[PDB]
């Protein structure tokens, strides 16, 4: 039985000085709550595991953080937490490379790496890495990342 009051009560009972401009408590419950129930999509995500031959559940492209905001932009980071948590749930075979790239997109300025064939850069918005040939070499072998 889902009951989202617990994770709400776990976050709103962390302490924050209200004098700041940006609230990491409030700017992530904005990115947390659907207006309706919208919790049977978890059960469609489970029910697709019996049917992974026909359908592969894909991470929703409007939920990826964009290739405009940095890691300092706060709701873009908590999307990348929500992608990394919901990684193994979705049955798409390119789920972990989208999980890996959505942070590698989000810190292309501090931490650059090498990305596969040309035409697919590090600031490619993490949804066009849906083919096995454009997995980065550092993701297959982390020794290749310095």
């Amino acid at each position: 039985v889902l009951d989202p009051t617990v994770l709400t009560n776990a976050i709103t009972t962390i302490s924050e000085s209200t004098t700041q401009t940006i609230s990491p408590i409030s700017e992530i419950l904005r990115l947390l709550q659907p207006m309706g129930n919208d919790y049977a999509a978890f059960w469609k995500c489970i029910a697709s595991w019996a049917y992974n031959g026909l359908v592969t559940t894909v991470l929703s492209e409007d939920a990826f953080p964009d290739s405009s905001q940095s890691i300092t932009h706060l709701p873009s980071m908590w999307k990348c937490l929500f992608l990394t948590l919901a990684g193994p749930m979705t049955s798409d075979p390119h789920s972990p490379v989208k999980v890996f790239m959505a942070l590698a997109n989000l810190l292309a300025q501090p931490e650059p790496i090498a990305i596969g064939v040309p035409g697919m850069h590090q600031t490619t918005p993490a949804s066009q890495f849906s083919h096995p040939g454009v997995w980065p070499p550092g993701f297959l072998n982390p020794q290749l990342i310095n």
Binding site: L2, D3, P4, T5, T8, N9, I11, T12, T18, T19, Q20, T21, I22, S23, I25, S26, E27, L29, R30, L32, Q33, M35, G36, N37, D38, Y39, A40, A41, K44, D66
Partner: protein
């Protein structure tokens, strides 16, 4: 002048005020308002004779040569009285005939007269071809005269009152004495030349005198006649005489307009001739400007924000124009002069073209020429018979050039059929878009959620006023006791009388027998006093529920309307300005008669087959909104027909196919024609229903998408145009809402396109709608028109003819109002002259003249024969109209962008405060005690002398009669309310939320100990909101009007000489204005037409701020912190409830008690309350808890960055440190910055950097005192 000498002496005394010579005290405002009402209205035209003046205009005597109305009216089938078309088959409006023989004399006024009562008696009793034929003409001809707010007899009187004395020059150096003279205006001269016919002893009888019941016509003398076209001619000239002095029109351009009205009055059926030339003046100026050789100027360099679906816009500089940027489109001159040759008005065309070629470049002066000619179009609200409004224009069936073959359909699945995949025309893309959009609703778990089902049932009740009570027809299969609810006094409309009775009977025992002939049109009786209107039954809207939802999913990913009060001024206006720029040329695609273009013959058979195959996904055994699963009879396989279980979501489509194919039963029961009454089907959707007309938006983007990608890249013959049509995309190049929308060309080959290629495009696009019957109203004038708003080279063109100075649409033969509702029409009439920019001083001079007549009211009670009211002068100040002069300073310094309310009263009492302390330190004794904001100076006695407190409370007092039955007597109140409560509270889960909400709040009202009995928007306010929204349209009894009337005079004369406890706290804050803020745009670029340096006040505001609303951290609140509400609860009242409790330090249970009150779940009430915070909120949204808000007059401006980082809560070198809002600047600074902008936009001239100087108490003293106020609320 001698015009000023001819005025009465109290009326002269107010022209001195309107000129700005003297301050407008209340005694001048009382006596001159009393001078208007006791005066005979015919004396106003005598004042026009007191001006000796000449201009080349001659009113012909051929106006008065009338037709015979009985030759223009006859009887046809079902015994309906209507107008046979004489010349052309749209000849349907008022014929120009003598009203003379149809009227008798009137008992009170012997000079005027209403309808002859022998014709009134028999035509309701015996249906004749003469008397019933007469009352049809009379009530329609009286209605077209009734289409004004008040009499144009008085609207000419305010204009002569403004022009009596010239305005005094203010010290602001940008003002000018106006170039226009009343002596040179042919509009006023044509009115004087007409009124030479209408005097018998130099008395100037008006041809009509529109009583608020209806127009009453002048009796003719023997030998002369009273045609109906003259009163319509006079109204259009007065509508032109007012606007041309507000637009500063050239006198050679009024004569261009006046000669068309005199030509239409010379012709027969004045409104029809005026309708055939409704698009002459925009075609001569707006649709064709810069087709000449010499072209140049400056244009905005607006860029589309590159994530395309965001629909954001940024002004990114200027663009200097050249001859490659002038429109490649052909001029509209050749199709327009042929239309002017049909009415012998070819000199009207050559007058404009001679004046248009005097504007070769794009300047401030050139766009003023466009709006001056667009002011020449008549904005007169044409009224035909509401029977004939439906018998012709709601009867046009489309012409399908490519119908779907019957072999293209499958076997039937119950009523519906599926489309075979073998057919692949544009019907397939219609079938495959509505199918996949229907698939995403059976998957969507937003339904089977009790709050989501409560919003949809709230959406049908609240949005439209409803038509009928077909449950009297729906007792035919189910025995209902049928309560008439005469023991509850409530209106029997479809809002309340239907849906309360729906809570007893389930849908499945009702949806099988919904099909009614008096489905809609009139209140459960075939003759009433109401017009046949659009919406239908709430349980046939409930069977139309999935058709709304699948249309919502199509428009979700494309049309992010976000359901906001500011969506025209945020999304439409910058798209209007991004279009018409010299980079891109546009095709403003309009779809005419789109409501009568969606039939079951083509469209509604495809979508009901697409929804039924689309709803096949998901559970086939699943109910929906109370409609269970059922057996369908499958007939697709010829060898294997069988019985299939289908869902309740597919069950509704089976009944919707039976309802769309039979049509929509419009029942006409208008009170204009004498007793014509017939219901009949049509394939025409209701017009104004935005929850149903979104299906037209759902097809507008969809059918353009098949055009731009499949049809036109294969059908067109131009090889060059196929390169353009390849990469056009409706997510980048087409924006739709409603039937109309802008088509955009790709930026590479946008302005360099050949016009011969574009003519081959639009030929194929017009032939593309022939496959659907969609008559496209394509325009190729290189101007923008998205939702009836215009552009020219990135300059917004305010259609002055769209909002008339005199006109007002009345769908009823009577106004159906008590007097003081005129005042709410004044403020709307004022702000339309502020949005559509006019000469801001002369419009403010006209407004105080126009509002002065709306200050006195007289009620006729058979018990009490005498009632007379008087609002003070300061009433209109609180409601929004800025004052022309204060005592002690110079006139016309208060801008028309002043806020209303306490926010506006703060702004006047700030710059005028320095006078108020000094003028009361003398001539008045000091206070015995001490006062915080004025010290020892006795300012609130002086404010009591000017009636500042008088107009303050008289404006806050209500002006609509509350109904007489209450709950304190033995009345049966909860008969229809508690059944409507059962309608909203269907599920016991949602009732358990709201009972939990009010139990926790009333526990925390006394335990937390801050308020008692305070209004918090629970869901039990919503039956109180709905049922009281039904008796507001009901005519109040004379006991309620007099109780409303006596409460006015008690409110004015009461000795409460204090403001509200917010404005008493606002006046501690002293703000001051430094230099002007640096510029947003280059003022050589015209932002809005009419905002030239002559109209100075609107010129600085669009220059200092800009007209593109910058989406910032705030973005003026497109988010409202609750994404979905039950319709009836204002989210403005919800954010002002939660954010107060966040400031007050409430426990989190206090938030949950409010959120359970509006119906949020316990899983949702925690998840909103932690989500809302005082730092994450927006700076406009913080100020809304203290009832400070952005006015409607600021919505067209870029107030975003100005409130952000030019308004100071604390400017550290200038201010005093008593105003340090330490630890409260998270929420006090949105109040302090917005009070800074509350006074910056009130001062005329350029927008200055606003600085809080000091607070009279501490800022901690003000943060404490607003905290006392927020506990009281």
């Amino acid at each position: 002048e001698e015009l000023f000498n001819a005025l009465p002496q109290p009326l002269q005394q107010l022209s001195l005020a309107l000129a700005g010579e003297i301050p407008l005290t209340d005694h001048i405002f009382e006596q001159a308002a009393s001078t208007w009402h006791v005066q005979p209205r015919s004396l106003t035209y005598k004042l026009l004779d007191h001006i000796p003046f000449a201009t080349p205009v001659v009113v012909p005597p051929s106006i008065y040569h009338s037709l015979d109305w009985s030759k223009c009216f006859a009887v046809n089938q079902d015994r309906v009285e209507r107008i046979p078309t004489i010349d052309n088959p749209d000849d349907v409006y008022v014929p120009n005939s003598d009203i003379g023989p149809l009227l008798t004399s009137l008992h009170t006024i012997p000079d005027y007269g209403f309808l002859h009562p022998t014709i009134e008696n028999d035509a309701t009793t015996l249906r004749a071809e003469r008397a019933r034929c007469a009352s049809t003409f009379y009530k329609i001809a009286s209605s077209q005269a009734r289409q004004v707010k008040l009499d144009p007899i008085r609207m000419l009187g305010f204009l002569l009152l403004v022009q009596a004395r010239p305005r005094v020059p203010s010290g602001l150096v940008t003002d000018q004495p106006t170039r226009r003279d009343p002596t040179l205006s042919p509009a006023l001269h044509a009115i004087w030349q007409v009124m030479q016919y209408y005097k018998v002893a130099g008395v100037y009888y008006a041809p009509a005198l529109v009583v608020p019941s209806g127009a009453i016509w002048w009796i003719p003398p023997p030998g002369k006649r009273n045609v109906v076209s003259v009163q319509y001619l006079l109204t259009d000239l007065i509508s032109l005489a007012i606007l041309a002095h507000m637009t500063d029109m050239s006198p050679t351009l009024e004569l261009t307009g006046v000669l068309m009205y005199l030509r239409a009055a010379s012709s027969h059926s004045y409104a029809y001739t005026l309708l055939q030339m409704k698009s002459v003046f925009p075609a001569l100026s707006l649709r064709s400007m810069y087709r000449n050789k010499g072209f140049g100027g400056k244009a905005p360099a607006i860029e589309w924000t590159e994530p395309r679906s965001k629909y954001k816009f940024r002004w990114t500089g200027v663009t200097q124009l050249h001859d490659g940027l002038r429109p490649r489109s052909p001029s509209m001159d050749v199709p327009t002069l042929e239309t002017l040759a049909k009415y012998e008005l070819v000199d009207i065309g050559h007058t404009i073209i001679r004046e248009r070629n005097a504007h070769p470049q794009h300047n401030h002066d050139s766009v003023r020429f466009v709006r001056d000619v667009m002011a020449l179009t008549s904005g007169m609200y044409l009224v035909r018979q509401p029977t004939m409004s439906v018998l012709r224009e709601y009867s046009q069936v489309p012409d399908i050039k490519d119908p779907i073959p019957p072999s293209a359909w499958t076997g039937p699945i119950g009523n519906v059929r599926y489309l075979l995949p073998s057919v692949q025309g544009p019907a397939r893309h219609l079938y495959d878009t509505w199918r996949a959009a229907a698939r995403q609703i059976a998957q969507d778990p937003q339904w089977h959620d009790p709050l989501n089902q409560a919003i949809m049932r709230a959406q049908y009740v609240t949005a439209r006023g409803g038509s009928s009570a077909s449950l009297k027809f729906a007792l035919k299969v189910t025995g209902i006791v049928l309560p008439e609810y005469d023991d509850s006094k409530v209106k029997k409309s479809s809002k309340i009388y239907q849906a309360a009775q729906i809570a007893r009977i389930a849908f499945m025992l009702l949806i099988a027998a919904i099909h009614a002939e008096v489905t809609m049109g009139i209140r459960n009786q075939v003759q009433r006093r109401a017009r046949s209107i659009m919406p239908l039954n709430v349980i046939q809207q409930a069977i139309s529920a999935p058709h709304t939802l699948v249309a919502n999913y199509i428009n979700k990913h494309m049309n992010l309307s976000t359901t906001s009060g500011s969506v025209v001024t945020d999304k439409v206006i910058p798209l209007i300005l991004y279009a018409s720029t010299p980079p891109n040329t546009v095709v403003n695609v309009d779809i005419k008669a789109c409501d009568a273009s969606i039939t079951y013959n083509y469209f509604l058979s495809v979508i009901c087959g697409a929804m039924h195959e689309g709803f096949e996904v998901g559970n086939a055994d699943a109910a929906f909104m109370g409609v269970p699963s059922t057996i369908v009879s499958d007939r697709r396989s010829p060898v294997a027909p069988y019985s299939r279980p289908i869902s309740g979501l597919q069950t509704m489509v089976q009944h919707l196919a039976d309802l769309y194919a039979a049509g929509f039963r419009y029942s006409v029961s208008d009170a204009f024609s004498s007793g014509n009454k017939f219901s009949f089907p049509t394939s025409t959707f209701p017009s104004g229903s935005t929850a149903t007309s979104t299906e037209h938006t759902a097809n507008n983007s969809t059918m353009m998408e098949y055009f731009l990608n499949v049809h036109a890249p294969s059908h067109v013959k131009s090889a060059s145009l196929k390169r353009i049509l390849t990469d056009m995309t409706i997510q980048r190049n087409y924006v739709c809402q409603g039937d109309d929308g802008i088509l955009l060309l790709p930026h590479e080959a946008a302005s360099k396109i050949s016009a011969d290629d574009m003519n081959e495009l639009l030929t194929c696009l017009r032939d593309y709608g022939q496959l659907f019957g969609w008559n496209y109203d394509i325009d190729w004038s290189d101007t923008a028109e998205y939702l009836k708003l215009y552009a020219l080279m990135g300059c917004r063109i305010p259609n002055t003819s769209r909002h008339p100075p005199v006109g007002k649409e009345y769908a009823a033969p009577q106004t159906d109002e008590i007097w003081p509702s005129l005042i709410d029409i004044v403020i709307g009439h004022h702000l339309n002259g502020v949005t559509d920019v006019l000469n801001w001083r002369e419009w403010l001079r006209f407004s105080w003249a126009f509002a002065c007549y709306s200050s006195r009211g007289g009620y006729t009670n058979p018990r009490g024969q005498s009632f007379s009211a008087q609002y003070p002068w300061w009433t209109f100040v609180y409601l929004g109209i800025p004052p022309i002069l204060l005592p002690g300073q110079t006139p016309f310094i208060h801008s028309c962008y002043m806020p209303p309310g306490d926010q506006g009263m703060f702004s006047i009492l700030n710059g005028w405060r320095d006078w108020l302390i000094s003028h009361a330190s003398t001539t008045l004794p000091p206070l015995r005690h001490n006062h915080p904001v004025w010290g020892l100076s006795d300012v609130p006695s002086l404010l009591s002398q000017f009636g500042v407190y008088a107009g303050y409370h008289a404006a806050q007092h209500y002006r609509r009669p509350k109904p007489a039955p209450e709950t304190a007597s033995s009345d049966s109140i909860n008969q229809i309310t508690s059944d409507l409560t059962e309608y909203l509270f269907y599920d016991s889960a949602l009732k358990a939320r709201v009972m939990k909400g009010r139990y926790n709040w009333e526990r925390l009202s006394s335990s937390l100990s801050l308020n008692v009995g305070s209004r918090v928007p629970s869901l039990f306010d919503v039956p109180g909101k709905w049922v009281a929204a039904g008796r507001d349209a009901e005519k109040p009894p004379p006991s309620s009007v007099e109780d409303m009337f006596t409460s006015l005079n008690r409110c004015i004369r009461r000795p409460t000489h204090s403001f509200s406890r917010l404005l008493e706290l606002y006046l501690r804050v002293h703000v001051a204005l430094g230099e002007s803020i640096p510029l947003a745009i280059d003022p050589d670029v015209p932002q809005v037409a009419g905002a030239d340096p002559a109209n100075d006040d609107h010129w600085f505001k669009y220059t200092c701020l800009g007209d593109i609303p910058s989406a910032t951290r705030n973005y003026f609140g497109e988010s409202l912190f609750v994404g979905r509400v039950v319709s009836g609860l204002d989210v403005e009242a919800v954010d002002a409830t939660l954010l107060r409790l966040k400031i007050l330090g409430a426990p989190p249970e206090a938030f949950i008690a409010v959120l359970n009150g509006i119906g949020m779940s316990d899983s949702e009430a925690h998840q909103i309350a932690g989500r809302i915070s005082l730092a994450n909120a927006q700076l406009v949204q913080i100020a809304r808890v203290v009832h400070l808000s952005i006015p409607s007059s600021w919505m067209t401006l870029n107030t975003g960055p100005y409130i952000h980082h030019h308004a100071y809560d604390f400017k550290p070198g200038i201010t005093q440190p008593s105003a340090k809002s330490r630890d409260k600047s998270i929420w006090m600074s949105p109040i302090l910055k917005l009070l800074c902008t509350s006074y910056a936009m009130t001062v005329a001239g350029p927008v200055r950097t606003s600085i809080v100087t000091e607070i009279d108490g501490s800022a901690a003293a003000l943060s404490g005192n607003l905290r006392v106020w927020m506990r009281d609320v």
